[PDB]
Amino acid sequence: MDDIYKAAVEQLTEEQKNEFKAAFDIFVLGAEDGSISTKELGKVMRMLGQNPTPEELQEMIDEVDEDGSGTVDFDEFLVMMVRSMKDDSKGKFKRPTLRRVRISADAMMQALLGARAKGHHHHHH
Ligand SMILES: NCCCCCCNS(=O)(=O)c1cccc2c(Cl)cccc12
Ligand SMILES: [Ca+2]
């Protein structure tokens, strides 16, 4: 990924990396290679209530696939989380376009992370 994103991944503390790593494992749940691909990508999207097609799944991976690997590995999935975090920027001018569907990284992470304790009423989630 980008040098900046790469640094961001390394910057994350043990807890931060562990927190993100949880999504990676869940994302590649059953993944033979262990990386997140379109098949795995769609699985996570389904959990979030999204059902993107294979074409969309590959495109989504490309977003975090600077190397054009086509898949989101441990370092790649971390970049996605970092990308959304950016310099504390969210954006609201994007509006529904060239997609019509917007999924927040934080919301997605909670969907994947929220599979153990709590999750019934968030509360400090
Ligand atoms: N404010 C949100 C920041 C934008 C970055 C999130 C991307 N938003 S996204 O809809 O393209 C998206 C959602 C969930 C998982 C994704 C995976 Cl595993 C790969 C690629 C895209 C993914
Ligand atoms: Ca990659």
Swiss-Prot record:
List of residues that carry N-acetylmethionine: 1
Annotated binding of Ca(2+) 1, by residue: 65, 67, 69, 71, 76
Function: Troponin is the central regulatory protein of striated muscle contraction. Tn consists of three components: Tn-I which is the inhibitor of actomyosin ATPase, Tn-T which contains the binding site for tropomyosin and Tn-C. The binding of calcium to Tn-C abolishes the inhibitory action of Tn on actin filaments.
Domain of life of the organism encoding this protein: Eukaryota
Species classification: Eukaryota, Metazoa, Chordata, Craniata, Vertebrata
Name used for this protein in its record: Troponin C, slow skeletal and cardiac muscles
Other known facts: Cardiac muscle Tn-C can bind 3 calcium ions per molecule. Domain I does not bind calcium.
Alphabetic keyword roster: Acetylation, Calcium, Cardiomyopathy, Disease variant, Metal-binding, Muscle protein, Phosphoprotein, Repeat
Gene Ontology MF terms in the entry: actin filament binding; calcium ion binding; calcium-dependent protein binding; protein homodimerization activity; troponin I binding; troponin T binding
